[model samples]
Target: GAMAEDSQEKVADEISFRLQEPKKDLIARVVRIIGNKKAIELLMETAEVEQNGGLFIMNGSRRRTPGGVFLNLLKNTPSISEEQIKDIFYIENQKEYENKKAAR
Candidate 1:
């Protein structure tokens, strides 16, 4: 529980930091898990990307195209770290999810 809570908190904090200053022409590959459509939709809405150009929404449950824009921006913004991006997507959670399935 502690680890889960900590990871979740870290993810939230990273999301906040990324949204602090929206960049122009920023492209995001939006996705939604099969049963998590509503949750994902809410997240995209809360993303508030309009100021920096709307996020590119994709169908199914994962990014359809390579995230070139994000990669480029991250490259340009030295202040931002890869860890922050990983946290924003809760990559750890995704790993845990896969691990759980593997364990079974």
Candidate 2:
């Protein structure tokens, strides 16, 4: 029961971190223009989004911290979106994910 609860809690924390997917105030504003849900999904693609906001929404867009005019334009592209997340957030790919799980 304890082990199960730990696993459940870890999963819960990960999901919670994802759903919140904190953004800077300005990024939040861009997300508003770009569509909040869409921005949130893009954020979830990244590797290291803190439950609390930290860094830019993605590595590619970190320069837009001030809401640079060059807002990300490819939110609908899953490959590019995942790539940005992997590049910026250090998100593990499928192989890394499997390896981490195997180690765990």
Candidate 3:
């Protein structure tokens, strides 16, 4: 319980938002795949949604958009179905996009 709160606090300090279970699990899964440091950094990178490329891959590199990064990092985890992953992406991306708009 305390560990969960602590994790939220740490994430909130940087992201300034609260993530629900599935979203948090998505982050945990990403961290599991890429290790803590890189995963967190990449998560931070994707926290900002650009004008045109919020859900889809933007470049040939296949890691430009937030969804792209999610797909790239999450591809190895066959346990998560594509529909579920898309739901998490939709939730996180919409929240971040709304938050960014509100801040402006």
Candidate 4:
């Protein structure tokens, strides 16, 4: 209940901000699920970690990628790499893909 409410609030906030700015044509979608507080908490935590250039460490996992390993060094981390930022940018602009023509 509370988890869903919080997630809805966060999604609403993100949607409102996106609408005001209109960064891309993509629309925000919010999913609601009952009794999923743990999932929501984990999602929120992951978002925070991503935003702060921190690596998300799941239980019993030690494998790391260059991107993740670099992110793990928060204090020394440079600005988010172009590739990482582009991933989000592409997601936001996904609607554009529908309008493009296939290469001949």
Q: Which number leads on TM-score?
A: 3
Best by lDDT: 3
For model 3, how does the per-residue alpha-carbon lDDT over 1-104 read when each residue is reduced to its tens digit? 55334353354333323233334555554454444454445454455433324443434654454335444434334344666555544354444547556665
Q: Over the stretch 31-93, how does candidate 1's per-residue lDDT look in tens digits?
A: 112112322333344433333542332342443123322332332333445665444443423
Reference-based lDDT, each prediction: 0.34, 0.39, 0.45, 0.37
**What value of lDDT does candidate 2 attain over all alpha carbons?**
0.39
Candidate 4's C-alpha runs over 4 A off are 1-4, 7-11, 14-39, 42-89, 96-104
Cα deviation of 66 in candidate 2 (Å)?
A: 14
Summed over model 3, clashes come to: 0
Error in Å for residue 71 of model 3: 5.8
Cα-lDDT of candidate 4: 0.37
- Cα lDDT tens digits, model 2, 34-70, are 3445454544443222333344335655543422211
Error of 1 at 31 (Å): 16
> TM-score: which is higher, 2 or 3?
3
Summarize candidate 4's per-residue lDDT along 34-93 as a digit string, tens digits.
112432443454455556654542331753432333223322223334454334323444
- TM-score, one value per model: 0.24, 0.25, 0.32, 0.24
